[PDB]
């Protein structure tokens, strides 16, 4: 199960091919045994080439396997196939009675042709295409269409004087070209599956009728596989063409019955299920673009689709493209709690995990955005840049330092209620994103409200806390981009930590916090800014 | 749709569970606690000594590890036994398995 | 703390799934309960809670109960309906504890031992 | 007047940090003033060597020569020369060794088969074929354990290295050991070690005794309760 590879790959003889199969990248997984085995009707794998060196005696030259680690990964390159290769196989790992394995299908076939009377036109869904067809001579004024024969009889698909199959309508167009040219070309739109088939050409109804048959293949996109552990994050890269700009762009996830059910769109559009936990980046040059999906879950593997459409949905014809998805669930992201409570003028205390090799980058924190084509912009990083609205009232800090730090912040109310991505500089890049409910009362801390104050004096403010704060340290702070500093020697028995300032300049002017200590972690704070008078 | 409730990985036990949703009949349904053992009758029972008589009896307390003696090598956590090596006498580490005791 | 399901009698007039939490041979009282689903407090008349009358046979200890009733048609559901008891005398003062259709007990089995050489691994 | 230049093995070092590398010259003449000198590649020479060897009782006579480097010099793998000025040949020959590089690294997969019933009849003595297989580079290191004491290596032989005819680089070995049958009838396992650099904690080991190594006989008594 927590092997990961293509299912089906087809190619045919005489061709190479090359396989991956996906692992996570723990310790073993890097250090054992890869193999690439045969089943059948018999009741067990015969293995075909290891890790370890052997090559079966029938593929000596004709194939090998290579590991990169690195990766998480293991390739299978196989050339010269036949048709004697085409059957059940499986990757995997460690020994081969057990399951530590994935299951492949492989069909080969011969390499067709031999009629060079008709030529092989593999072109994408949905895309254009155009057949160049010549006629000689006396075909000046004289029939040109083209026929489809399906099965029993030919059909048409388009004539010299306006007709149509209604199947192709509006999809075609027939030029011949001037300057002497003795050729035409046949143009259609919207490639669907429900047009590969055989044609024909014609030039005229007379006894010449030079015919060309011909074939008429379409793409599919072949899968892409991607491999990302449980509560997790994934970035997929859609590429599609500059000819559809100005049409919108969607994304669909396969299902039972051929019907993608759609996550975002162009339209605003969105899943339900995959409320916040989606971006969409605006759409480039090329309309280039990329979709960031966060906290991926267990039934959020499988197949992807995005594509561009009036509709931003599914239809017959339509440019796609693929991608394969898999959930590890062998997975080492830290559950980190997901959901946080806090009440209006209240505090909040968020843990953010990442990658503990790139703790030396540049955090960053994003607030998400409906009701649009989705948006996320920043609201703090690491050097110290806060969003010019929150000045006081927020701080991140790097308290627990293995991989994991704290976020503090105070002076809750329920307007800011939503949902919030934790990002990183690194390479390697989780999203790990928290939701903040808002619910009733009144927060723990204590504290005087908004205050002036006088310049030069000595002046006092207090900071109760309630019994279950009462077996941690006690603290104040003055907030900034460098955050919190406490003030050792302002204390009592259980509450009343009071702040005390001997003397007092205007450079002292600002927010300070009162706020208790974990241990190593940390927990409530609150907020007051004080004035200067004279 | 099983839901596994214990993996014991160093006793090779797995007790799922599924509930046969029947036929769409009322709740006439019955639940089902599928039981799996792989036991290795090749392991000692000192399982990191490789100096003990073999093992016979397995016994399988279902209700002690539905929550330390069991016996087979866990994939994942590798074992050792230092081991006397002689060149002159050396009292040295070993890795009693391979593919998983790399320090990588 | 113990969850007993509804009876299988219960079951067949088909509308009262009664549930069944409790406490026993306990000191002191005072103790507080109730039921949790999904993170989400029951309604506090949904169920009906006891007092903590004593013991028979202990010397002293206290127990107390609570019922609690739902739609046997959710009985299919069930999300185990998590009872949160809350005690004093706990070393996190919460011993919750829960149980659900497929909790309980099976009438079918299927154990299926294998044996083999290539083990000792656990995969 | 035949050299052998012997490299210390990977487990000599590795059970020594002590990277000694010796040349020997085997059935010379000894007189006195045998003379042989070590060299690195740059021609410098390197530390001196002591303990000399003498004339050998039948005439197969000998000289050690002994030095030392730092580990990484070998691992950089550059030529090593001690050679041989006598007035024999007073010709300095010329002995260069070095490490081969490429050499990819591969593991020991170490079997340990047990000894063939059709030996037991003969009813006094045992075999058992602690088996190495299938890696790089050469020059793997076995001996035998049992019972937490080291077997004196007379009792077992070891083969050298020698390629697979499957494995293009892959070497392989041996080891025998004979033992009386009551001995190994009498239960008392046998563990084979084996150390080599590709191996992650640097040394593995299996074992087997009678029992385990290809018993008749399976006596499971498993009990499962509380169902
Ligand atoms: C029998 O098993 C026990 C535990 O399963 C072993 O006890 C310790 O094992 C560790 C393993 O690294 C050693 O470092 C300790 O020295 C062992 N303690 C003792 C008192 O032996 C024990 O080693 C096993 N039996 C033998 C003979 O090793």
């Not at chain 2, 006793?11 to 599928?34: G, L, M, Q, Y």
């Not at chain 3, 299919?76 to 706990?90: D, K, P, S």
């Not at chain 4, 007035?87 to 002995?95: A, E, I, R, V, Y």
Request: charged share 20%; with cysteine.
């Amino acid at each position: 199960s927590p092997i990961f590879g293509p299912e089906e790959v087809n190619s045919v003889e005489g061709n190479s091919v090359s396989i991956t199969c996906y692992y996570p990248p723990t310790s073993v997984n890097r250090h054992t045994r890869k193999y690439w085995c045969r089943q059948g009707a018999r009741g067990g794998c015969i293995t075909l080439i290891s890790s370890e060196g052997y090559v079966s005696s029938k593929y000596a030259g004709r194939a090998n396997l290579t590991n990169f680690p690195e990766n998480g990964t293991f390739v299978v390159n196989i050339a010269q196939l036949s048709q004697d290769d085409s059957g059940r196989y499986k990757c995997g790992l460690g020994i081969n009675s057990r399951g530590l394995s994935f299951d492949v299908s492989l069909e080969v076939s011969q390499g067709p042709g031999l009629l060079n009377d008709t030529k092989v036109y593999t072109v994408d869904l949905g895309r254009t295409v155009t057949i160049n067809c010549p006629f000689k001579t006396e075909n000046a004024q004289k029939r040109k269409s083209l026929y489809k024969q399906i099965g029993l009889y030919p059909v048409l698909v388009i004539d010299s004087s306006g007709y149509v199959n209604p199947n192709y309508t509006g999809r075609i167009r027939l030029d011949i070209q001037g300057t002497g040219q003795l050729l035409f070309s046949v143009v259609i739109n919207q490639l669907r599956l429900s047009d590969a088939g055989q044609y024909l050409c014609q030039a005229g109804d007379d006894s010449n009728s030079n015919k060309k048959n011909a074939d008429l293949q379409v793409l599919k996109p072949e899968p892409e596989l991607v491999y990302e552990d449980l509560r997790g994050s994934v970035t997929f890269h859609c590429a599609l063409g500059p000819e559809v700009a100005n049409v919108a762009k969607f994304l669909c996830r396969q299902s039972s019955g051929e019907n993608c059910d759609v996550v975002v769109n162009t339209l605003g559009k969105r899943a339900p299920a995959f409320e916040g936990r989606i971006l969409l980046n605006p759409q480039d040059k090329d309309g280039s673009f990329s979709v960031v999906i966060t906290g991926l879950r267990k039934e959020d593997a499988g197949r992807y689709l995005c594509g561009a459409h009036s509709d931003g949905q599914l239809q017959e014809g339509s440019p796609i493209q693929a991608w394969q998805l898999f959930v590890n669930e062998e997975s080492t992201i830290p559950r980190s709690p997901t959901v946080v409570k806090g009440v209006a003028g209240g505090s909040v205390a968020v843990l953010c995990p990442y990658n503990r090799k790139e703790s030396k980058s540049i955090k960053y924190w994003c607030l998400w955005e409906g009701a649009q084509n989705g948006r996320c912009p920043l609201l703090v990083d690491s050097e110290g840049w806060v969003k010019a609205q929150y000045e006081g009232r927020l701080s991140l800090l790097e308290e627990p330092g293995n991989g994991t730090f704290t976020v503090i912040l105070n002076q809750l109310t329920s307007r800011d209620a939503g949902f919030y991505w934790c990002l990183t500089n690194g390479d390697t890049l989780w999203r790990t994103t928290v939701e903040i409910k808002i619910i009733e009362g009144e927060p723990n801390l204590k504290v005087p409200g908004n205050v002036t104050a006088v310049l030069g004096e000595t002046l006092k403010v207090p900071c109760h806390f309630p019994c279950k704060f009462s077996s941690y340290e006690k603290y104040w702070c003055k907030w900034n981009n460098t955050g919190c500093q406490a003030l050792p020697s302002c204390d009592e028995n259980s509450r009343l930590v009071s702040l005390t300032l001997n003397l007092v300049t205007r450079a002292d002017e600002g927010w300070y916090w009162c706020g208790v200590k974990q241990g190593h972690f940390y927990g409530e704070t609150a907020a007051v800014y004080v004035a200067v008078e004279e | 749709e099983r839901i596994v409730l214990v993996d014991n990985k160093c006793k090779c036990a797995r007790i799922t569970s599924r509930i046969i949703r029947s036929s769409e009949d009322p709740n006439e349904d019955i639940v089902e606690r599928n039981i799996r053992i792989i036991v290795p009758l090749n392991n000692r029972e000192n399982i990191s000594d490789p100096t003990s008589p073999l093992r016979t009896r397995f016994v399988y307390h279902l209700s002690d590890l539905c929550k330390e003696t069991c016996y087979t090598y866990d994939r994942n956590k590798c074992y050792t036994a230092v081991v006397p090596l002689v060149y002159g006498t050396k009292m040295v580490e070993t890795a009693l398995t391979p593919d998983a005791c790399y320090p990588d | 703390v113990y969850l007993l399901p509804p009876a299988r009698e219960q079951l067949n007039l088909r509308e009262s799934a009664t549930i069944t939490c409790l406490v026993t041979g306990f000191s002191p009282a005072d103790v507080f309960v109730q039921w949790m689903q999904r993170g989400q407090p029951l309604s506090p008349e949904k169920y009906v809670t006891s007092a903590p009358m004593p013991e028979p046979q202990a010397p002293g200890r206290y127990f107390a109960h609570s019922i609690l009733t739902v739609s046997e048609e959710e009985w299919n559901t069930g999300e185990t309906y998590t009872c949160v008891v809350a005690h004093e005398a706990l070393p996190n003062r919460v011993t919750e504890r829960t149980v659900d259709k497929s909790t309980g007990k099976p009438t079918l089995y299927n154990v299926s031992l294998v044996m083999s050489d290539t083990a000792g691994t656990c995969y | 007047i035949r050299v052998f230049a012997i490299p210390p093995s990977f487990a000599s070092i590795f059970l020594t940090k002590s990277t000694k590398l010796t040349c020997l010259v085997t059935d010379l003449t000894t007189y006195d003033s045998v003379t042989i000198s070590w060299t690195r590649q740059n021609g410098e020479a390197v530390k001196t060597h002591t303990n000399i060897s003498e004339s050998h009782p039948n005439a197969t006579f000998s000289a050690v020569g002994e030095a030392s480097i730092c580990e990484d010099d070998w691992n950089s793998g550059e030529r090593f020369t001690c050679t041989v000025t006598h007035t024999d040949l007073p010709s300095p020959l010329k002995q260069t060794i070095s490490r081969p590089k490429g050499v990819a690294l591969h593991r020991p997969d170490v079997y340990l088969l047990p000894p063939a019933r059709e030996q037991l009849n003969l009813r006094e003595s045992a075999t058992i074929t602690c088996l190495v297989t299938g890696f790089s580079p050469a020059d793997v290191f076995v001996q035998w354990m049992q019972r937490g004491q080291p077997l004196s290596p007379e009792k077992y032989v070891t083969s050298a290295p020698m390629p697979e005819p499957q494995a293009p680089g892959r070497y392989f070995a041996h080891s025998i050991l004979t033992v009386s049958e009551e001995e190994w009838n009498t239960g008392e396992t046998y563990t084979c070690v084996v150390a080599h650099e590709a191996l992650p904690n640097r040394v593995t080991e299996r074992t087997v005794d009678k029992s385990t190594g290809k018993p008749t006989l399976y006596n499971v008594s498993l009990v499962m309760s509380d169902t």
